[PDB]
Each structure stands twice: as structure tokens, then as C-alpha cells.
Design an enzyme around this catalytic site. Structure first.
Site, mmCIF file in Angstrom:
data_model
loop_
_atom_site.group_PDB
_atom_site.id
_atom_site.type_symbol
_atom_site.label_atom_id
_atom_site.label_comp_id
_atom_site.label_asym_id
_atom_site.label_seq_id
_atom_site.Cartn_x
_atom_site.Cartn_y
_atom_site.Cartn_z
ATOM 1 N N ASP A 132 3.001 14.429 14.308
ATOM 2 C CA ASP A 132 2.992 14.376 12.877
ATOM 3 C C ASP A 132 1.574 14.532 12.343
ATOM 4 O O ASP A 132 1.185 13.896 11.356
ATOM 5 C CB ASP A 132 3.688 13.100 12.377
ATOM 6 C CG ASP A 132 4.133 13.173 10.933
ATOM 7 O OD1 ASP A 132 4.108 14.236 10.284
ATOM 8 O OD2 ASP A 132 4.492 12.064 10.408
ATOM 9 N N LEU A 147 0.811 -1.209 0.000
ATOM 10 C CA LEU A 147 0.000 0.000 0.000
ATOM 11 C C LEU A 147 0.847 1.263 0.000
ATOM 12 O O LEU A 147 0.409 2.312 -0.487
ATOM 13 C CB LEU A 147 -0.875 0.014 1.229
ATOM 14 C CG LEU A 147 -1.969 -1.009 1.307
ATOM 15 C CD1 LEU A 147 -2.598 -0.982 2.677
ATOM 16 C CD2 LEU A 147 -3.019 -0.659 0.255
HETATM 17 C C1 LIG Z 1 -2.977 1.339 8.492
HETATM 18 C C2 LIG Z 1 -3.921 1.400 7.287
HETATM 19 C C3 LIG Z 1 -3.746 1.792 6.014
HETATM 20 C C4 LIG Z 1 -5.042 1.586 5.391
HETATM 21 N N1 LIG Z 1 -5.371 1.821 4.072
HETATM 22 C C5 LIG Z 1 -4.631 2.447 3.116
HETATM 23 C C6 LIG Z 1 -5.264 2.691 1.852
HETATM 24 C C7 LIG Z 1 -4.615 3.374 0.868
HETATM 25 C C8 LIG Z 1 -5.181 3.781 -0.487
HETATM 26 N N2 LIG Z 1 -4.791 2.880 -1.538
HETATM 27 C C9 LIG Z 1 -5.531 1.609 -1.427
HETATM 28 C C10 LIG Z 1 -5.122 0.663 -2.616
HETATM 29 O O1 LIG Z 1 -5.260 1.308 -3.888
HETATM 30 C C11 LIG Z 1 -4.641 2.609 -3.997
HETATM 31 C C12 LIG Z 1 -5.082 3.509 -2.809
HETATM 32 C C13 LIG Z 1 -3.303 3.777 1.139
HETATM 33 N N3 LIG Z 1 -2.403 4.481 0.386
HETATM 34 C C14 LIG Z 1 -1.295 4.571 1.174
HETATM 35 C C15 LIG Z 1 -0.088 5.288 0.670
HETATM 36 C C16 LIG Z 1 -1.523 3.945 2.396
HETATM 37 C C17 LIG Z 1 -0.636 3.797 3.530
HETATM 38 C C18 LIG Z 1 -0.988 4.627 4.759
HETATM 39 C C19 LIG Z 1 -1.339 5.957 4.570
HETATM 40 C C20 LIG Z 1 -1.599 6.790 5.596
HETATM 41 C C21 LIG Z 1 -1.608 6.320 6.865
HETATM 42 CL CL1 LIG Z 1 -1.986 7.347 8.206
HETATM 43 C C22 LIG Z 1 -1.258 4.985 7.154
HETATM 44 C C23 LIG Z 1 -0.952 4.182 6.060
HETATM 45 F F1 LIG Z 1 -0.600 2.920 6.346
HETATM 46 N N4 LIG Z 1 -2.779 3.430 2.336
HETATM 47 N N5 LIG Z 1 -3.401 2.792 3.322
HETATM 48 N N6 LIG Z 1 -5.851 1.057 6.243
HETATM 49 N N7 LIG Z 1 -5.188 0.971 7.383
#
Ligand SMILES: Cc1cc(Nc2cc(CN3CCOCC3)c3nc(C)c(Cc4ccc(Cl)cc4F)n3n2)n[nH]1
Length: 300
Positions: free
Chosen positions: A144, A23
Site C-alpha cells: 500500500d 486523528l
Molecule cells: C501512526 C501516527 C500517526 C501520526 N500522526 C498523524 C497526524 C495527522 C495530522 N493531523 C494532526 C492533528 O491535526 C490535523 C492534522 C494525521 N492525520 C491523519 C488522517 C492521521 C492518521 C494517519 C495517517 C497516515 C498514516 Cl501512514 C498513519 C496514520 F495513523 N494523522 N496522523 N503519528 N503517528
């Protein structure tokens, strides 16, 4: 020594956690989407799995502390902790969390403008403030806060995540002085964090003011805090000179501008969060109440 800390190593066994896709890698670690299917019947639950990017002894220790923080939090606006996977034959640690489909609020605001209006922005503002009120009750400083570090469950619900920089206040002090600084999100930092490495509930409030700006700028791209501050400082500047200029700007009342379309009253909330006098900043409880009163006072 005699008896080691409690752990539930059979709760998420690595053999039942199937990798689907990465992700991202970022400040949030390296996070993957996995499916946890203990009955191996292609059912189970999609989860988010957080991993270290550099498994040094120091980072593993910090990761343990982050896991303990997250385990201690249960709130509607905080991403849900599920457990830990002791993978690599119980020689590694991965953090299991609920999966929220829309990703970061920063990305959601850019990708889903068709479903965003000021009412939704104020609802998200309220929710973030309440999650932060809850952190305050545990004397936790997030350090953060930014829309990149808030997740979107659906159009009606956001949750803080990214507790990777969170600290616990000393018993007898109202600030944490970080004495090993690393990479800093400088354009969200309060002036005393930039100049003295001091972090507090009030520096989280400063950062929340930046989040509120981010929400209300969502209509544009040139308008993010890094882009706007660099425009004000000079886009040509590099290295420490950037920080020097940012400090000098903030100390003498330089501020991000009112976003186009932003109500004066919302900009006033931002401005009050951006007070160089730490003690004059509002509390998260003040903010939640004011924002919910604004919402409630509209017609209907
Ligand atoms: C802990 C958690 C993450 C989560 N879901 C997603 C969903 C998405 C969106 N994706 C889905 C798949 O197709 C493309 C679009 C995504 N993009 C990024 C960069 C992250 C990583 C992330 C970003 C911010 C934060 Cl605070 C914590 C993270 F771990 N995630 N995380 N659920 N629970």
C-alpha cells in the site's frame, strides 16, 4: 499452550493513556492522539494509538501480525513502534506508536507548499526508498505504498507507516499471492497485482513510481492518480468496468503523464518503475543510489 507468547502488558497501561482527539479513520485503522502520563503530573509523551474499526476475530489476528511486523522494524524512515496497550481490562489490543505532527505526506504537500521545492521532493524520495530497502531485507511487501501512507515528522524527515496490508514473502517464492482480496488501492497497483493478485518487492517498486508521480504533481489537484486515470478511462465509468479499463490501459503502455515541471530524468525513473516486465523494474537500492546521485550532482 503451556506458556503463552511474551507480552509486556504493564508497559502502556490503559489508565495512564489519556484520549485527546481522533486523528482519523482510514486504511490506517482508527487512530487517536493520546497522552501517556504514568506520573499523572500532566507531563508524559503524546503518542499515536491505532485501533481496529471492526474488531472481528480475523481483524484482531491480522492486527497481531501487523504489530509483530512493526515491532520488528527499526529504521529512520519507518514510524517508530512504542508498544501495545492491552486495554478494556486486557480484553482488547491497541498499538502505540510515536506521534508525527504533520500527518500524511499527501496532506503535507497540499498544506505546506510554501516550504516544498524539488530538492525537498528528492530528499523525501530518497528516504522512502531507503525505508523500502530496509523492508526488503525482511522479505516484507508493503502493498500500500502511497503518499497517504507516509508520515511527515518535519520538513527534513518522512517515514513510512500503514503496515496494515504488509505481507511476508513465502520462504521459497519471490511473490505473495493474496487469496482473500479485499478493498484494493487499484490506481497504485502493478498490472500483475490487478490480474493475478501477485505482490512482490517489484510491485512495491511500481507503487513507488506512483508515489514519485504524486510528489511531483503536488502543485495541482486534478492531477492525482485516481483523477488522472479516470480522465483517461472516462469519468462516467463505474464499477468493474473501471478495473477492466485500467488493466487494458496498463497492459498496452498507458501511463500517467509527466507532471508539469517534472524533470525528464525524474519522469524516466517513474517510467522505469512502471515496467510491465516485473524483473526489469529497478530495485529500491538502485533507486536510492540514483536519486542520491542526482541530488549530489547538483551545483554546491
Ligand atoms: C501512526 C501516527 C500517526 C501520526 N500522526 C498523524 C497526524 C495527522 C495530522 N493531523 C494532526 C492533528 O491535526 C490535523 C492534522 C494525521 N492525520 C491523519 C488522517 C492521521 C492518521 C494517519 C495517517 C497516515 C498514516 Cl501512514 C498513519 C496514520 F495513523 N494523522 N496522523 N503519528 N503517528
Amino acid at each position: 499452550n503451556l506458556y503463552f507468547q511474551s507480552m509486556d502488558p504493564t508497559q502502556f497501561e490503559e489508565r495512564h493513556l489519556k484520549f485527546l482527539q481522533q486523528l482519523g479513520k482510514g486504511n490506517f485503522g482508527s487512530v487517536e492522539m493520546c497522552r501517556y502520563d504514568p506520573l499523572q503530573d500532566n507531563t508524559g509523551e503524546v503518542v499515536a494509538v491505532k485501533k481496529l474499526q471492526h474488531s472481528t476475530e480475523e481483524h484482531l489476528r491480522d492486527f497481531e501480525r501487523e504489530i509483530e511486523i512493526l515491532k520488528s522494524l527499526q529504521h529512520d524512515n519507518i514510524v517508530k513502534y512504542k508498544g501495545v496497550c492491552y486495554s478494556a481490562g486486557r480484553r482488547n489490543l491497541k498499538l502505540i506508536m510515536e506521534y508525527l505532527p504533520y500527518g500524511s505526506l499527501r496532506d503535507y504537500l497540499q498544506k505546506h507548499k510554501e516550504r516544498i521545492d524539488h530538492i525537498k521532493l528528492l530528499q523525501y524520495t530518497s528516504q522512502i526508498c531507503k525505508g523500502m530497502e530496509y523492508l526488503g531485507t525482511k522479505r516484507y511487501i508493503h502493498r500500500d505504498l502511497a503518499t497517504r501512507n507516509i508520515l511527515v515528522e518535519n520538513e527534513n524527515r518522512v517515514k513510512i507507516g500503514d503496515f496494515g496490508l504488509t505481507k511476508v514473502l513465502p520462504q521459497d517464492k519471490e511473490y505473495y499471492k493474496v487469496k482473500e482480496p479485499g478493498e484494493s488501492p487499484i490506481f497504485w497497483y502493478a498490472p500483475e497485482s490487478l490480474t493475478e493478485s501477485k505482490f512482490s518487492v517489484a510491485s512495491d517498486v511500481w507503487s513507488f513510481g506512483v508515489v514519485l508521480y504524486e510528489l511531483f504533481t503536488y502543485i495541482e489537484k486534478s492531477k492525482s492518480p485516481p483523477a488522472e486515470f479516470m480522465r483517461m478511462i472516462g469519468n462516467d465509468k463505474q464499477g468493474q468496468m473501471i478495473v477492466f479499463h485500467l488493466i487494458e490501459l496498463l497492459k498496452n503502455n498507458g501511463r500517467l503523464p509527466r507532471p508539469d515541471g517534472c524533470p525528464d530524468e525524474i519522469y524516466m525513473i517513474m517510467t522505469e518503475c512502471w515496467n510491465n516486465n516485473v524483473n526489469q523494474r529497478p530495485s529500491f537500492r538502485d533507486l536510492a543510489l540514483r536519486v542520491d546521485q542526482i541530488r549530489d550532482n547538483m551545483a554546491g
